[PDB]
Each structure stands twice: as C-alpha cells, then as structure tokens.
Amino acid sequence: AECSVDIQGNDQMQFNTNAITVDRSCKQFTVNLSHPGNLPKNVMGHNWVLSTAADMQGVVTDGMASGLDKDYLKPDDSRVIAHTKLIGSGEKDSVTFDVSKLKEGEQYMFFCTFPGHSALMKGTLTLK
Ligand SMILES: [Cu+2]
C-alpha cells in the first residue's frame, strides 16, 4: 500500500499532480507539500486543502475572506477534511489524515485556497 504522496506548488500557480489515489487499505494517508521557486508566501503561498467536491467553492471563498494570518482558511471550517499550512518558497509542510474520513461514492477535491489559485491549483482525490 502506498499511503503518501509528495506534491509541489510552484511560482507559476501549478501543483505537479491533478489526481491523487488513496489506497483504502491505508489507515492514514500523508501529503508532503513543498514549494520550489523563489516567491514568498504573501504573494505565491500554497496550501493543500481537502474537502468534498461540493464544498470546495465555499471553502475557497470563506478562506479568501479569512486572510493571510489565517492561512486563507475559515477557522475550524467543518468542511475541511484535512489541510497543510500555507507555505512560501523553500518551505514545506505535511498533513496526515485518517482514511476512514473518506466515504464510498463521495467525490473529493484537493486545492490551494490562496486567493486566485484554486482555478488551476486543484485536483481529484479518490479511494482505491
Ligand atoms: Cu497556491
């Protein structure tokens, strides 16, 4: 079982994958996020946020309203299944979450909630 993935967010508003697969035999799954490039967090910050596909737009909008000091996430947002912190160039973060939080049939998305980034910086997350 492959229970982790390394993902990069760069200076050109790209993640280097748009589809993550979570083996359902994994008890926990880990996302290791890094940021190649040289732009700082306040202008090209990236996070990795997981929600249902239906909830993404709300999470992104409310995250915008929350601001940089809150890593562009609504505090205690019930729709956020898991998330990293917001990182700038040269920085990294990891998040580990319980695979039991994912339910058969539901559609999940990952994305960055930094203002303006989610249109490109998004992808699917799917049980196997
Ligand atoms: Cu971003």
UniProtKB/Swiss-Prot annotation:
InterPro entries associated with the record: Azurin (IPR014068), BlueCu_1 (IPR000923), BlueCu_1_BS (IPR028871), Cu-binding_ET (IPR050845), Cupredoxin (IPR008972)
Protein name: Azurin
Disulfide bond residue pairs: C3-C26
One GO term describing the cellular component: periplasmic space
SUPFAM superfamilies (UniProt xref): Cupredoxins
Predominant location category: periplasm
NCBIfam families per record: azurin
Single Gene Ontology MF annotation: identical protein binding
Coiled-coil ranges from the UniProt annotation: none
Taxonomy, superkingdom: Bacteria
Residues that hold Cu cation according to the record: H46, C112, H117, M121
Keyword match Nucleus: no
Protein purpose: Transfers electrons from cytochrome c551 to cytochrome oxidase.
Alphabetical keyword list: Copper, Disulfide bond, Electron transport, Metal-binding, Periplasm, Signal, Transport
Metal-binding is among the record's keywords: yes
Gene: azu
Ranges where the Plastocyanin-like domain occurs: 1-128
Compartments where located: Periplasm
Pfam families: Copper-bind (PF00127)
